[PDB]
Amino acid sequence: TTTTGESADPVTTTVENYGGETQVQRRHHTDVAFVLDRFVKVTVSDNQHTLDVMQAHKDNIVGALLRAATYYFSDLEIAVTHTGKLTWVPNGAPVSALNNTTNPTAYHKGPVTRLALPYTAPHRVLATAYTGAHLPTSFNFGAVKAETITELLVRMKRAELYCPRPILPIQPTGDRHKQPLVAPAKQ
Amino acid sequence: SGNTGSIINNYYMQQYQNSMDTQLGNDWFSKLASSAFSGLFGALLA
Amino acid sequence: SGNTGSIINNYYMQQYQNSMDTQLGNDWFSKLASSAFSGLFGALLA
Amino acid sequence: SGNTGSIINNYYMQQYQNSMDTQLGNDWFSKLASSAFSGLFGALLA
Amino acid sequence: GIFPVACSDGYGNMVTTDPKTADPAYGKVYNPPRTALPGRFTNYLDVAEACPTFLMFENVPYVSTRTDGQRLLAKFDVSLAAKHMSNTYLAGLAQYYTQYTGTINLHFMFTGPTDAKARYMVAYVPPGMDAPDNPEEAAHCIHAEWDTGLNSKFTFSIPYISAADYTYTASHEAETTCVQGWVCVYQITHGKADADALVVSASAGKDFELRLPVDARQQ
Amino acid sequence: GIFPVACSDGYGNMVTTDPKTADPAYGKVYNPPRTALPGRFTNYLDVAEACPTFLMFENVPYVSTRTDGQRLLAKFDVSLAAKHMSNTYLAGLAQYYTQYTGTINLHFMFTGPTDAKARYMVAYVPPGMDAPDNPEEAAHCIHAEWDTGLNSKFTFSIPYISAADYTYTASHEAETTCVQGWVCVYQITHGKADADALVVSASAGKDFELRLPVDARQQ
Amino acid sequence: GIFPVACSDGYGNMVTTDPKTADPAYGKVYNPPRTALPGRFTNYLDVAEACPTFLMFENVPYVSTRTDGQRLLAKFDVSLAAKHMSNTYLAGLAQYYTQYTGTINLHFMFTGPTDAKARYMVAYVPPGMDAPDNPEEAAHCIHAEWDTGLNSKFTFSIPYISAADYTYTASHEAETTCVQGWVCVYQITHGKADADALVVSASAGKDFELRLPVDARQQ
Amino acid sequence: DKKTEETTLLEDRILTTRNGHTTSTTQSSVGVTFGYATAEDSTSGPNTSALETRVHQAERFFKMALFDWVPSQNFGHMHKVVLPHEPKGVYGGLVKSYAYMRNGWDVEVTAVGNQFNGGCLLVALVPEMGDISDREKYQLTLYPHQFINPRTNMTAHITVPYVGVNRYDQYKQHRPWTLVVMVVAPLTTNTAGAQQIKVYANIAPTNVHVAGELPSKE
């Protein structure tokens, strides 16, 4: 199957060309909405933290995959292990609000406290990159504050992605990257 | 939609569970993947 | 009505959940806002 | 099927509760047990 | 057997803002009849459209004709935080939402005597340049000129023209210039109009919207 | 009485991956309209089929005609871990699933000048022997020969032929040889073609599937 | 208000054997196709009916013709614990149920040479007396005599005749005698048949049932 | 694209592009790559209180040079630029008089050498491009692209829509599109190739809309 390579028009041959027989697939697992729909730890440093998905580890499935797109939309779900009252505040709220309790404040019930929050930016969509680097103030989902924030996780719901960006693995030392895989106890 | 599998509907209204989208006026790579040439371009013998 | 979004009805009778109002005999600012003049009052050219 | 006896169906979709099998194309010992000869092979008197 | 349930962790926490309703205890109570009580309002923004409140220019609601000729009577930031709003209902309200979109209405009522005549211009200077100090430079923005006559009042809408669909009511520290431009109001000329007051107020426009309630304030 | 329930032990534990949804708190929020934003993608593997990325041979995407004659231009492991993949989208993606099945497409675009002609061969050497270093030995595997001409590009599918229905993206330490064989690409001859580049890329095949998402990496 | 529930005490405890199903977490997984794999079995007792395994008489499956005449070739306890069962599938299986009922089948395959002829008798001695050591005394129980010929094998059913409807697979310490009697197999005569082997096996009968699974064993 | 006569030793696959009163014929096309979509989203959003307008005059060709491709520069050598960059003429004028604006791009990159050169360039357009790593030059094909390869073509053509987290932008401080060109196969020169190749661009701002007229001193 010769093509004019310069074209940039997609080409996909099949085993049928030599006599094989292409089968069926179920790429459920490689579905955007699906893969990103799980919790990811985000490194919290203070007892107050602005919610931002870019803070997931760049090599963590979710963060790696989120960064494999340039623009994205989604709602949020959060799981915080905290102490005292947890207060959330919507994108663009004066930071001073975090102390006020008439804002969505959840009392303690350990271990974690789980919530569902609405996309709250004022743009039609948000971005992974930006050339106008360091991302803009407004690219957040609000902020959280609790007397103590031991741990923080976030989950992207309803995810939409636009324009793919690259995504690299590990550069192997030798011919392939060998390593220890889950195996049964020797006995 | 995503990693969600409850058979019974949410106890809460969808107006509270999620953000509601507005419209003003199926997508792309999906379409593009399919428009891929898969023939031969030549002339086949045997 | 207010910040309330349960799809299923209250387990308790409404006679207990709330106070019942009595009547004896849609409102105002709402009406007043709408009665606002929005034209021009002049005579328009071009 | 196995040691399971809830009369009401799973709250979760079966797509999540279990692995889905695929097909490509009642069994054996069951059949074999039944094909067992049970007569006499001889000629019976009395 | 009884019905087997899974009490999920991370569910049930109090929450000052949840959409449920507490159980009750004192029931069978009947409220006195409040049928047709005057002045009910259903949504704040209605009163905000219906009643325009005053802007402020150093303790006063009006603007004063300095002297005859091309003078710039006022110029200000297009934010609900703006100093000129401050005493404004619209701002007092906006202070509880992070975002907004919409048209804002400016009203100019000339208070002068029957022998006092003037002509004014008002424009909306979108950001990207610096607010011009004279009409001829401002004449290039969305503007409107008008003279005095039988009709004391003149209303004018300030267009929502921004990159994003919504914008903040609040003002960030990092913002030097008012993210949404300014509106400058000039005087073109006058005669016997010096000293005279042009009191201005502002009301919410038809498509003006307030969203995302927030409680940032002292206690 | 009230409804008797059994709160089952071992049920309710948090779980970073459960298919439920947390209760909400801030409602009645309306997103700005995002109708028809260009370039949306729904499933990664679509882009993976549509856009073939480059293989690597010591810092470069192409292969270079050493000299005229039966030379073995390249040979490599059929694993998404393979050194030659590495910079490949397919591999960068596969790194998050344990298993896979499917056809993989190889693309060879000849970059030479109009006076440079060559003929190549590519084969898939299933495991069981050692990858042959010359065509005549490789001529016995599933292969395909082809010359240069008007058409710069030539695509070729690498068949999933394994004992099991699925295979690992990952590579075990205990594996000396690439569990899935190799693909060697030769040159049969050429003329005035020495020096010239034959850049190669790889895209996902039609029946290519990725399954069982996993997060093994640093943090 | 919300729905008032009573979390009953004494309900919810784990339980290694409950008929519920845990919540899930990793979903949307598709198994490789296993259509028509040979040799599937659905219920153990089917294989137990279909394949008779061997009895044991001191390291051997057969019984040996001591010498011509009225000899008692074997005699044993009717329990799945019996020493003669031991290597028997039926017993290896029965070891996991407390009770049983049903018919058990005994199979006698004569292995001798074409010139070796014999005649045997098998009886089921219900408890109440002591197992007779000679046919004429045993001739009064449910028995069956038979000679050798073209047909190597002879099958015979051991009747469930007990006071209760079910009986134990297990054997109590307090039981001196086998609660369910014995089965003795004699030889009536023979000629040139001395030395020759009469290998015996046992399979589950049609109405044979195993009930009440139990795990008593080491770990 | 295609041409007639019959076959021949020269080139064919002719194609003429036209924006405004400007054309661009090319007897060696390889087609035109289309962006992330075939049509831009709604040009009249709420964010513009519908005071936006469109200027047909801006949508015309304008040229701007890129670099010289020489055998020295080998794999991964890349030349990037953010559009608009310094904009002149009508199009330029818009930027000085309107607060916000939006438009897509009609890009035609032309590396004219000669059919005896070997080597090959990759030209693409990227949204919010912020410095690629060396490794991720390998996955540059994920962007609207098109190759130039001397044995085959002289011109690469790519048309692309306006994008951004905002319906309208302030080009004066955010542009989404970045036109890049990278060497994938170093330039071969052989006996009769061209010593070096001059690379230019023919561009047209497509579907230009502007909103929020600014004040003015001149």
CSV table of C-alpha atoms in Angstrom, one decimal, chain A:
chain,number,residue,atom,x,y,z
A,1,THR,CA,0.0,0.0,0.0
A,2,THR,CA,1.9,2.9,-1.4
A,3,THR,CA,0.6,6.4,-0.7
A,4,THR,CA,1.8,9.9,-1.3
A,5,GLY,CA,3.4,10.3,2.1
A,6,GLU,CA,3.6,14.0,2.1
A,7,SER,CA,-0.2,14.3,2.1
A,8,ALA,CA,-0.6,13.8,5.9
A,9,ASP,CA,-3.9,12.0,5.2
A,10,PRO,CA,-4.3,9.0,7.5
A,11,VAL,CA,-3.6,5.5,6.2
A,12,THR,CA,-4.3,2.3,8.0
A,13,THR,CA,-3.7,-1.0,6.3
A,14,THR,CA,-4.8,-4.4,7.6
A,15,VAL,CA,-3.6,-8.0,7.9
A,16,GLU,CA,-6.0,-8.7,5.1
A,17,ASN,CA,-3.4,-7.3,2.7
A,18,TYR,CA,-1.4,-10.5,2.9
A,19,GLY,CA,-4.2,-12.8,3.8
A,20,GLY,CA,-4.9,-12.3,7.5
A,21,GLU,CA,-8.2,-11.4,9.1
A,22,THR,CA,-8.6,-8.2,11.2
A,23,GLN,CA,-10.6,-8.9,14.4
A,24,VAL,CA,-12.8,-7.0,16.9
A,25,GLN,CA,-11.8,-4.6,19.6
A,26,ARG,CA,-13.3,-3.1,22.7
A,27,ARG,CA,-11.4,0.1,23.4
A,28,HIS,CA,-13.6,0.9,26.4
A,29,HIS,CA,-10.5,1.2,28.5
A,30,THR,CA,-8.9,3.7,26.1
A,31,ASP,CA,-12.0,6.0,26.3
A,32,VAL,CA,-11.3,9.5,27.5
A,33,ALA,CA,-14.3,10.1,29.8
A,34,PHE,CA,-13.6,6.8,31.3
A,35,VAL,CA,-9.8,6.7,32.0
A,36,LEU,CA,-9.8,10.2,33.6
A,37,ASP,CA,-12.8,9.3,35.8
A,38,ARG,CA,-10.8,8.2,38.8
A,39,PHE,CA,-9.1,9.8,41.8
A,40,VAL,CA,-5.6,11.1,41.8
A,41,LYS,CA,-3.5,12.4,44.7
A,42,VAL,CA,-2.5,16.0,44.5
A,43,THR,CA,0.4,17.4,46.7
A,44,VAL,CA,-1.1,19.8,49.2
A,45,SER,CA,1.3,21.9,51.1
A,46,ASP,CA,-0.6,24.2,53.3
A,47,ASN,CA,-3.9,23.9,55.2
A,48,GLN,CA,-5.5,25.8,52.3
A,49,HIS,CA,-5.2,24.8,48.7
A,50,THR,CA,-6.4,26.0,45.3
A,51,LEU,CA,-8.1,23.2,43.3
A,52,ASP,CA,-6.2,22.7,40.0
A,53,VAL,CA,-6.0,19.6,37.9
A,54,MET,CA,-2.6,20.5,36.4
A,55,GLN,CA,-1.2,19.6,39.8
A,56,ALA,CA,-1.6,15.9,39.3
A,57,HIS,CA,1.8,14.2,38.7
A,58,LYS,CA,2.8,14.5,35.0
A,59,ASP,CA,3.6,10.8,34.9
A,60,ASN,CA,0.5,9.7,36.7
A,61,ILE,CA,-2.1,8.1,34.4
A,62,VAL,CA,-4.6,10.9,34.9
A,63,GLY,CA,-2.1,13.8,34.7
A,64,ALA,CA,-0.2,12.2,31.9
A,65,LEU,CA,-3.4,11.7,30.0
A,66,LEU,CA,-4.9,15.1,30.8
A,67,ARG,CA,-1.6,16.6,29.5
A,68,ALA,CA,-2.1,14.6,26.3
A,69,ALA,CA,-4.8,17.1,25.4
A,70,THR,CA,-4.5,20.9,25.1
A,71,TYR,CA,-8.0,22.0,26.1
A,72,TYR,CA,-10.3,20.3,28.5
A,73,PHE,CA,-13.7,20.6,30.3
A,74,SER,CA,-15.0,18.6,33.3
A,75,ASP,CA,-16.8,18.6,36.6
A,76,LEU,CA,-15.0,17.7,39.8
A,77,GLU,CA,-15.3,15.3,42.7
A,78,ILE,CA,-12.9,15.7,45.6
A,79,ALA,CA,-11.8,13.5,48.5
A,80,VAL,CA,-10.1,15.3,51.4
A,81,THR,CA,-8.7,13.8,54.6
A,82,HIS,CA,-8.8,16.9,56.8
A,83,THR,CA,-9.6,18.1,60.3
A,84,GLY,CA,-12.2,20.6,61.6
A,85,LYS,CA,-14.3,22.3,59.0
A,86,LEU,CA,-13.6,22.0,55.3
A,87,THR,CA,-14.7,25.0,53.3
A,88,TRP,CA,-14.9,25.4,49.6
A,89,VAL,CA,-15.0,28.5,47.5
A,90,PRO,CA,-15.9,29.0,43.8
A,91,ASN,CA,-13.4,30.2,41.1
A,92,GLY,CA,-12.7,33.9,41.4
A,93,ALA,CA,-13.7,34.3,45.0
A,94,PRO,CA,-11.6,36.6,47.3
A,95,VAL,CA,-9.3,34.3,49.2
A,96,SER,CA,-10.7,35.9,52.4
A,97,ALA,CA,-13.8,33.8,51.8
A,98,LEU,CA,-12.2,30.5,52.8
A,99,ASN,CA,-12.7,31.5,56.4
A,100,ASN,CA,-16.4,32.1,56.1
A,101,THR,CA,-18.6,29.2,56.9
A,102,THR,CA,-21.8,30.2,55.0
A,103,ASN,CA,-19.8,29.0,52.0
A,104,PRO,CA,-20.0,25.3,51.2
A,105,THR,CA,-18.5,24.1,54.5
A,106,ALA,CA,-18.5,20.4,55.4
A,107,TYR,CA,-18.1,19.3,59.0
A,108,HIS,CA,-15.8,16.4,59.9
A,109,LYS,CA,-16.7,12.8,59.5
A,110,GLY,CA,-13.6,10.8,59.1
A,111,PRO,CA,-11.7,9.5,57.4
A,112,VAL,CA,-12.2,11.4,54.2
A,113,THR,CA,-14.9,13.8,53.1
A,114,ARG,CA,-16.2,13.4,49.6
A,115,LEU,CA,-17.8,16.1,47.4
A,116,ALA,CA,-19.1,16.8,43.9
A,117,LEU,CA,-18.3,20.2,42.6
A,118,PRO,CA,-19.4,22.0,39.4
A,119,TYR,CA,-16.9,23.3,36.8
A,120,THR,CA,-16.7,26.9,37.9
A,121,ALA,CA,-14.3,28.8,35.6
A,122,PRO,CA,-15.6,31.6,33.3
A,123,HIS,CA,-14.1,30.3,30.1
A,124,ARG,CA,-15.9,28.0,27.7
A,125,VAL,CA,-13.1,25.5,28.4
A,126,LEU,CA,-9.7,25.4,30.2
A,127,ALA,CA,-6.2,24.6,29.0
A,128,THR,CA,-3.2,22.4,29.6
A,129,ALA,CA,-0.8,24.8,27.8
A,130,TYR,CA,-0.9,28.5,27.0
A,131,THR,CA,1.2,31.0,24.9
A,132,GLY,CA,0.1,34.4,26.2
A,133,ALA,CA,5.1,29.5,30.3
A,134,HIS,CA,2.7,29.9,33.4
A,135,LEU,CA,-1.1,29.3,33.4
A,136,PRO,CA,-3.6,32.1,34.2
A,137,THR,CA,-5.2,32.8,37.6
A,138,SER,CA,-8.7,31.8,36.4
A,139,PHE,CA,-7.8,28.2,35.4
A,140,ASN,CA,-9.0,26.7,38.7
A,141,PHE,CA,-12.0,24.9,40.3
A,142,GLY,CA,-12.1,27.1,43.3
A,143,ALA,CA,-10.2,26.6,46.5
A,144,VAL,CA,-10.4,24.7,49.7
A,145,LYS,CA,-9.4,25.4,53.4
A,146,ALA,CA,-9.6,23.3,56.5
A,147,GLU,CA,-7.8,23.7,59.9
A,148,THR,CA,-5.8,20.6,58.7
A,149,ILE,CA,-5.5,19.1,55.2
A,150,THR,CA,-3.6,15.8,55.6
A,151,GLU,CA,-4.3,14.5,52.0
A,152,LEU,CA,-6.1,15.6,48.9
A,153,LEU,CA,-7.5,13.7,45.8
A,154,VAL,CA,-9.5,14.8,42.8
A,155,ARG,CA,-11.6,13.1,40.2
A,156,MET,CA,-12.6,14.5,36.8
A,157,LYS,CA,-16.2,13.8,35.8
A,158,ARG,CA,-17.7,14.4,32.4
A,159,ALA,CA,-14.3,15.0,30.8
A,160,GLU,CA,-13.9,16.4,27.3
A,161,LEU,CA,-10.6,16.8,25.5
A,162,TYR,CA,-9.5,18.8,22.5
A,163,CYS,CA,-6.4,18.7,20.3
A,164,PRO,CA,-3.9,16.0,21.2
A,165,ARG,CA,-0.5,16.8,22.7
A,166,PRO,CA,2.3,14.2,22.9
A,167,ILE,CA,2.7,11.6,25.7
A,168,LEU,CA,6.1,9.8,26.3
A,169,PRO,CA,7.0,6.6,28.2
A,170,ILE,CA,10.4,5.8,29.7
A,171,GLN,CA,13.5,5.9,27.5
A,172,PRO,CA,15.0,2.4,27.8
A,173,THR,CA,18.7,1.9,28.5
A,174,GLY,CA,19.0,-1.2,26.4
A,175,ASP,CA,16.9,-2.7,23.6
A,176,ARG,CA,13.7,-2.8,25.6
A,177,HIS,CA,12.7,-1.8,29.1
A,178,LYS,CA,12.6,-5.0,31.2
A,179,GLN,CA,11.3,-4.9,34.8
A,180,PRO,CA,9.5,-6.9,37.6
A,181,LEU,CA,5.9,-7.7,36.9
A,182,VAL,CA,3.3,-9.0,39.3
A,183,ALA,CA,3.9,-12.8,39.5
A,184,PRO,CA,2.8,-15.6,41.8
A,185,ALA,CA,4.9,-16.6,44.8
A,186,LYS,CA,7.6,-19.1,43.6
A,187,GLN,CA,7.1,-21.9,46.2
